[PDB]
């Protein structure tokens, strides 16, 4: 139909909901859970307001065999329409550890109800990684320069989280933690700094060994992956240029304010230094009468 899924904002309510339904069907040992996603579309940001479970039994002999109740879906939707009438089918969540190619056929099934392009929201119920437990994808049709016809394939969508004003304050009520990824005080940004740098160091290591797997282990070659690395090399900063010399000059300026402010606080504290000592003299008189 269209691509309007450039941003996906996801309510925190939905993530919490997903784990609750996963356990209350008790799908383990590589069993899946699928529920509908309700919310807005026709907006570049896709708003994930709500979800609800659909009964869905997933096979263990194959991944190509599943039961899904089509009649169930409409009933859930008309009820929730009564609550708020801005909710329509915008996709379905898969709760597997990662992505499958038998989700493509399911995606096509939900294309019937939608008037948008179905969002596959892989809600991870394993809480892997320190970052988001959500990757998002939408099924899109392409041809490609290899000689490949009429492909259906999932293109990653960057994932973001927004919350409403009422929704956000509920989190704050529930939690009081201070968050190892926070950028707060001096000690906290110091920890963020070293954490952020090592974050990049991990991802770059993967690419290097991924490149080997193409050219000795025959993983597929794709121009989307090679093209992105090209961009990195082309817009890479350079030092020893007249940009670098201005940085250093900007750098003295910041070191200058720090040095001024260091001296400023020595004055204030030295004032306190005196005043403790005056108070001592007065209290000596008091102690002698005492």
């Amino acid at each position: 139909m269209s691509l309007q899924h450039e941003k996906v904002t996801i309510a925190p309510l939905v993530l919490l909901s997903a784990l609750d339904h996963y356990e209350r069907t008790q799908t383990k040992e590589n069993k899946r859970c699928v529920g509908v996603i309700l919310g807005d579309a026709n907006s570049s940001t896709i708003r994930v307001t709500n979800s609800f479970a659909l009964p869905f039994e997933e096979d263990e002999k194959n991944s190509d065999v599943w039961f899904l109740d089509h009649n169930y879906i409409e009933n859930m939707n008309e009820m929730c329409k009564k609550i708020n009438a801005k909710e329509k089918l915008i996709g379905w969540y898969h709760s597997g550890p990662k992505l499958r190619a038998s989700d493509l056929k399911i995606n096509e099934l939900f294309k019937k109800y939608t008037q948008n392009n179905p969002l596959l929201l892989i809600v991870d119920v394993k809480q892997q990684g320190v970052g988001l437990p959500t990757d998002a994808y939408v099924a899109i049709e392409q041809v490609k320069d290899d000689g490949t016809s009429t492909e259906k394939t999932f293109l990653h969508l960057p994932c973001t989280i927004e919350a409403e004003e009422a929704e956000e304050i509920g989190v704050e009520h529930l939690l009081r933690d201070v968050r190892d990824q926070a950028a707060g005080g001096l000690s906290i940004r110091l920890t963020n700094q070293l954490k952020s740098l090592k974050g990049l160091q991990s991802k770059l290591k993967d690419v290097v060994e991924y490149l080997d797997k193409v050219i000795n282990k025959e993983l597929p070659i794709n121009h989307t992956i090679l093209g992105k690395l090209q961009d990195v090399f082309n817009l890479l900063p350079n030092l020893g240029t007249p940009d670098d010399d201005e940085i250093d000059v900007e750098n003295h300026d910041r070191i200058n304010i720090s040095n001024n402010l260091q001296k400023a606080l020595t004055v204030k504290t030295n004032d306190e230094l005196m005043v403790i000592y005056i108070s001592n003299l007065v209290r000596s008189i008091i102690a002698f009468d005492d």
């Binding site: 001096l186 000690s187 110091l190 750098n251 070191i255 720090s258």
Partner: peptide, 14 residues
């Protein structure tokens, strides 16, 4: 190094 100087400032304070 530059990094070393800035690291020194923060830890004296804290």
């Amino acid at each position: 190094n530059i990094i070393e100087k800035a690291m020194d400032y923060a830890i004296s304070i804290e």
